[PDB]
RNA sequence: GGAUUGAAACGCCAUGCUCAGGCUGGCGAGUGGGCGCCACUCUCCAA
C-alpha cells in the first residue's frame, strides 16, 4: 500500500537516557526520535514529514562499559 | 536540506632487581673349585 520497511544493524549503539547524560547510559531500545533522525539522513526536504509506526527488535540485550577523556 | 539530549572531545607526560656466598668432608669385589675318563694306517700289488 504505502510506507516502507527498512533494516539496520551494527556493532555499537548508544541512545543516552536524558537523566543520566553526564555519565552516559543507554536505553534498552532505540527511541522513535533516533528513527526519525536516521530516515532523514537518506532523503528529506522541507515540504514533507516523517511518521514512525513500529519497530522490531531481533536480538537479545547486552551491555558493556567504556571510558574516555 | 532545521534540529538522531545531537553537532566538537588523547590517558598523557618518565623511572637499574640491585649489591655476594666451598657439595663438602671418606669407605678392600672379597672369600675358593682336576678337561677328564680311552681307541691299529691297515689290508696286496715284475725292473
Distances (CA, A) of A40 to A10, A23, A44, A48: 19, 28, 5, 11
Lookup: nucleotide whose C1' is closest to A13 CA: B4
CB proximity A21–strand B (7 Å threshold):
yes
CB proximity A52–strand B (7 Å threshold):
no
Give, in Å, how far the C1' of B42 lies from the CA of A59: 120
String of DSSP letters for A6-58: -----S----B-GGG-SS--B-SS--HHHHHHHHHTT---TT-----------
Amino acid at each position: 500500500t504505502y510506507g516502507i520497511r527498512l533494516r539496520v544493524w551494527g556493532d555499537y549503539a548508544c541512545f543516552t537516557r536524558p537523566e543520566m547524560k553526564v555519565e552516559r547510559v543507554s536505553y534498552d531500545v532505540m527511541p522513535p526520535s533516533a528513527a526519525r533522525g536516521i530516515l532523514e539522513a537518506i532523503h528529506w526536504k522541507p515540504a514533507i514529514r516523517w511518521i514512525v509506526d513500529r519497530i522490531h527488535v531481533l536480538r537479545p540485550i547486552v551491555f558493556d562499559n567504556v571510558r574516555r577523556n
